[PDB]
Scaffold this active site. Structure first.
Site, PDB file in Angstrom:
ATOM      1  N   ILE A 112       0.888  -1.130   0.000  1.00 16.30           N
ATOM      2  CA  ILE A 112       0.000   0.000   0.000  1.00 16.30           C
ATOM      3  C   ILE A 112       0.921   1.173   0.000  1.00 16.30           C
ATOM      4  O   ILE A 112       0.706   2.153  -0.715  1.00 16.30           O
ATOM      5  CB  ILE A 112      -0.791   0.062   1.260  1.00 16.30           C
ATOM      6  CG1 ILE A 112      -1.794  -1.079   1.236  1.00 16.30           C
ATOM      7  CG2 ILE A 112      -1.424   1.451   1.398  1.00 16.30           C
ATOM      8  CD1 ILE A 112      -2.486  -1.283   2.532  1.00 16.30           C
TER       9      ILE A 112
ATOM     10  N   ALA B   1       5.953   5.273   8.818  1.00 16.31           N
ATOM     11  CA  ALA B   1       6.289   5.158  10.234  1.00 16.31           C
ATOM     12  C   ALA B   1       6.321   3.712  10.649  1.00 16.31           C
ATOM     13  O   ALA B   1       7.148   3.317  11.448  1.00 16.31           O
ATOM     14  CB  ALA B   1       5.325   5.901  11.063  1.00 16.31           C
ATOM     15  N   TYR B   2       5.343   2.941  10.211  1.00 18.02           N
ATOM     16  CA  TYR B   2       5.394   1.521  10.501  1.00 18.02           C
ATOM     17  C   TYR B   2       5.773   1.056   9.127  1.00 18.02           C
ATOM     18  O   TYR B   2       5.199   1.536   8.127  1.00 18.02           O
ATOM     19  CB  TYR B   2       4.038   0.997  10.914  1.00 18.02           C
ATOM     20  CG  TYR B   2       3.441   1.875  11.947  1.00 18.02           C
ATOM     21  CD1 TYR B   2       4.142   2.162  13.101  1.00 18.02           C
ATOM     22  CD2 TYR B   2       2.217   2.485  11.749  1.00 18.02           C
ATOM     23  CE1 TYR B   2       3.649   3.045  14.030  1.00 18.02           C
ATOM     24  CE2 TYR B   2       1.713   3.367  12.678  1.00 18.02           C
ATOM     25  CZ  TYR B   2       2.441   3.649  13.818  1.00 18.02           C
ATOM     26  OH  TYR B   2       2.011   4.580  14.735  1.00 18.02           O
ATOM     27  N   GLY B   3       6.816   0.239   9.101  1.00 21.84           N
ATOM     28  CA  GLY B   3       7.385  -0.296   7.873  1.00 21.84           C
ATOM     29  C   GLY B   3       6.663  -0.067   6.568  1.00 21.84           C
ATOM     30  O   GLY B   3       6.414   1.061   6.149  1.00 21.84           O
ATOM     31  N   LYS B   4       6.418  -1.146   5.856  1.00 21.99           N
ATOM     32  CA  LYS B   4       5.688  -1.016   4.628  1.00 21.99           C
ATOM     33  C   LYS B   4       4.352  -1.617   4.978  1.00 21.99           C
ATOM     34  O   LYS B   4       4.280  -2.459   5.890  1.00 21.99           O
ATOM     35  CB  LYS B   4       6.335  -1.869   3.548  1.00 21.99           C
ATOM     36  CG  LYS B   4       7.804  -1.588   3.285  1.00 21.99           C
ATOM     37  CD  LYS B   4       8.129  -1.863   1.805  1.00 21.99           C
ATOM     38  CE  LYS B   4       6.903  -1.545   0.912  1.00 21.99           C
ATOM     39  NZ  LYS B   4       7.213  -1.499  -0.541  1.00 21.99           N
ATOM     40  N   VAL B   5       3.274  -1.138   4.383  1.00 16.88           N
ATOM     41  CA  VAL B   5       2.033  -1.815   4.660  1.00 16.88           C
ATOM     42  C   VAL B   5       1.512  -2.326   3.319  1.00 16.88           C
ATOM     43  O   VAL B   5       1.773  -1.710   2.279  1.00 16.88           O
ATOM     44  CB  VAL B   5       1.017  -1.025   5.632  1.00 16.88           C
ATOM     45  CG1 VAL B   5       1.448   0.373   5.890  1.00 16.88           C
ATOM     46  CG2 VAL B   5      -0.401  -1.073   5.138  1.00 16.88           C
TER      47      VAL B   5
ATOM     48  N   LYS C 292       1.040  -5.507   8.207  1.00 11.74           N
ATOM     49  CA  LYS C 292       2.032  -4.630   8.814  1.00 11.74           C
ATOM     50  C   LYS C 292       3.062  -5.605   9.442  1.00 11.74           C
ATOM     51  O   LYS C 292       2.737  -6.361  10.376  1.00 11.74           O
ATOM     52  CB  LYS C 292       1.373  -3.639   9.838  1.00 11.74           C
ATOM     53  CG  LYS C 292       0.503  -2.479   9.146  1.00 11.74           C
ATOM     54  CD  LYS C 292      -0.599  -1.682  10.026  1.00 11.74           C
ATOM     55  CE  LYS C 292      -1.830  -1.101   9.129  1.00 11.74           C
ATOM     56  NZ  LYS C 292      -3.041  -0.356   9.737  1.00 11.74           N
TER      57      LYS C 292
ATOM     58  N   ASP D  76      -2.413  10.361  15.384  1.00 13.62           N
ATOM     59  CA  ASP D  76      -2.345  10.666  13.942  1.00 13.62           C
ATOM     60  C   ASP D  76      -3.708  10.648  13.251  1.00 13.62           C
ATOM     61  O   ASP D  76      -3.908   9.984  12.225  1.00 13.62           O
ATOM     62  CB  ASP D  76      -1.404   9.655  13.263  1.00 13.62           C
ATOM     63  CG  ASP D  76      -0.981  10.071  11.830  1.00 13.62           C
ATOM     64  OD1 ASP D  76      -1.561  11.035  11.265  1.00 13.62           O
ATOM     65  OD2 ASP D  76      -0.048   9.417  11.274  1.00 13.62           O
TER      66      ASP D  76
END
EC number: 2.7.11.22
Lengths: 264, 155, 264, 155
Positions: C9, C13-17, C33, C108
């Site tokens: 996607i 901030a959190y790796g790749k989604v 995630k 967020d």
């Protein structure tokens, strides 16, 4: 209410702990650990969280009327059966592993925090209660049981997770033994005892800061554990020593121990 | 009550030594109630036959009940420590005493599935007593599906 | 395995989604995630925790093919219907509240972390992905969207829970608006924008340490929010401003907002 | 594949702008597969009609399938974005294409309960195709209890 206290099991690190009745549904003894603030088969389950004041909590835990000690102290002259040991041992590790991941460290693995059901299922516990051994022979003197405390801790260096593994080896040993393996009266004395068996580790395995440096101790041997843990087998001997290793980085993991060929 | 508490707690923790100390080199009456009015034999570590024995040898009324009419034999049986169940019995404990809900020792055993207990008890137990749910040991053994049990019971 | 990746996607901030297929049972798109370590209708549910190495985990989450933005950016010229707003808004708060208790702070709340189903159910999310706005008019320059960041945070003073409430008001506004309310390019610029509407708070509402003191800014008005959030109603105006209040202690709670007369 | 990934990710995130950029001021072939071999129209934010449109206008094979034989129309319908379902259709997407389990678009709609989709599809769909569970749209509409649906279907 839905539980009925019947006795203070005792008082220790965590307040007083009690034995109660789970009439809430019916029968079953239970343990109450009173707490003020401001799933696994081999681990005692938390059952409830009663609010005693809107905070005071009262945790209601699973409880069993038998610990590893009364059981061993009970078994027939020949001893716990090989597979029985292997079995308790597996579970003891299994729940241990479960604790570790979920980043929890037991830190107090004595055989009294080890419950064993009539069935034989092992469930770890943590009452933070002490037991004070008076000593055998002339110069008698008390000791609380630290006979399961890792070197790292006696040395006051490390307090890392492997800490629990040391404790399991001590227990494993005691299943073949039916008597604690290393039983001293002082932190330094305890260190002595460990060493007479496992032997003076290498200078490179002992830590700096430490108030008790390697030099404080003799080299004297590295005796074959089996003249102590009588009747263990070779695959066990391996696992035992993999736990009982002075250097914590170089000490087997629960996760790993679990995959050991003793449980083939 | 003090010693009630000192002896009970010992029992509960399965500390034989203390129990034997507080009994002998201390002289606590086995039946001494704790601040909750239960005696030690009542709250003892049921799997600690040695404690059960020690208490029963210094006296200790084996026949005693809970608020919920429960007792040493119900506990033992429910917990599976036959070793202790025997001791209790061998010392006069009454096996046919019903608990508050009507269930008696053997009901508990069946309920829990302690085959050898069920075996040990069946003989001396009134297998006709009805459960709170109206069940007799066998009817519950059945209600559960405890084959091995049902069989013991059949006789 | 029981899921089939179909695309990254994005990465943030959190790796790749990733977007995947939940063939495990069947169909449904899902989000992955990836995570290394060493219930509510309005919140995306965690579905699974695949262990990719015995630790690497792979969290499988609920996912929806629509966010608050594409929806607003899609609605008919007159706009989201009053009750629709009121509705999304209620849920947005409802799940918000749920997050807060259980002591979680979203931090967020942009409209891209706001999923809206074809049905209209709102489920919050958190991809930690950025979006970079290039600017309109001559002196163009990029900005990542902080248009939803609270004063406390732009000021780097507080980062308390009310933080999320600021963000909701910003959104609420944007439901009537269908265009972000406060849209600057710098932390100080953003501050400007907030203030032109809400007005220079009182010296007693601004914090000490802060690199940007009240004096750094003009007093200039306290414009009537409604000449911005066109068409809001009076009860909404109240709730809106109860969120959009510079001073965080004096800012409405989710719990409270939820009980507000806008949802009578 | 690079651009496969740059365009898909955009689509997926519903970023219209990028999709329009990477398409125009970049020139990515709509059908460009990502490192997972899926095209963007396939993985796009199904509720983002504008993206669907944009892709389909630059080409984008509307008729494409998944490993599990699934496709834009199944997704759309299953997700309920009729707006997009139309677009797909209006651009040649085939509504009567069965998924790996036999279910076709309309099966999904019924399954999910997207009434207007079911409505939109029923017309052009083979209501006789059998589900993996052997069901036709109506039989499932029934199996579910989707009154409103059953009704649409009846015709």
């Amino acid at each position: 209410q839905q539980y009925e206290c019947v006795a203070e099991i005792g008082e220790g690190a965590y307040g007083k702990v009690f034995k109660a009745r789970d009439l809430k549904n019916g029968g079953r003894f239970v343990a109450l650990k009173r707490v003020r603030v401001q799933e696994h088969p081999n681990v005692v389950r938390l059952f409830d969280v009663c609010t005693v004041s809107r905070t005071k909590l009262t945790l209601v835990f699973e409880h069993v009327d038998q610990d590893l000690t009364t059981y061993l102290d009970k078994v027939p002259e020949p001893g716990v059966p090989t597979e029985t040991i292997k079995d308790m041992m597996f579970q003891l590790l299994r729940g241990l592993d479960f604790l570790h991941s979920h980043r929890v460290v037991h830190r107090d693995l004595k055989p009294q925090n080890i419950l064993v059901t009539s069935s034989g299922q092992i469930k770890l516990a943590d009452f933070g209660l002490a037991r004070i051994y008076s000593f055998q022979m002339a110069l008698t003197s008390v000791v609380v049981t630290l006979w399961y405390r890792a070197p790292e801790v006696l040395l006051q260096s490390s307090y890392a997770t492997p800490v629990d593994l040391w404790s399991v080896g001590c227990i494993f040993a005691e299943m073949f033994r039916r008597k604690p393996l290393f039983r001293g009266s002082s932190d330094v004395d305890q260190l002595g005892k460990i060493l007479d068996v496992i032997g003076l580790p290498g200078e490179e395995d002992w830590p700096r800061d430490v108030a008790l440096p390697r030099q404080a101790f003799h080299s004297k041997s590295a005796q074959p554990i089996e003249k102590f843990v009588t009747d263990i087998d070779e695959l066990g001997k391996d696992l035992l020593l993999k736990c009982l290793t002075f250097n914590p980085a170089k000490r087997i993991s629960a996760y790993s121990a679990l995959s050991h060929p003793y449980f083939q | 009550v003090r010693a009630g508490d000192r002896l009970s707690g010992a029992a509960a923790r399965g500390d034989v030594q203390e129990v034997r100390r507080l009994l002998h080199r201390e002289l606590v009456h086995p039946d001494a109630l704790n601040r909750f009015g239960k005696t030690a034999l009542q709250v003892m570590m049921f799997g600690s036959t040695a404690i059960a024995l020690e208490l029963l040898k210094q006296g200790a009324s084996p026949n005693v009940q809970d608020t919920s009419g429960t007792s040493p034999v119900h506990d033992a049986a429910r917990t599976g420590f036959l070793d202790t169940l025997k001791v209790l019995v061998e010392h006069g404990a009454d096996v046919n005493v019903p608990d508050g809900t009507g269930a008696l020792p053997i009901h508990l055993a069946v309920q829990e599935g302690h085959t050898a207990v069920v075996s040990f008890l069946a003989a001396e137990s009134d297998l006709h007593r009805r459960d709170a749910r109206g069940l007799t040991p066998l009817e519950l053994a059945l209600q559960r599906g405890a084959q091995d049990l049902v069989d013991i019971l059949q006789g």
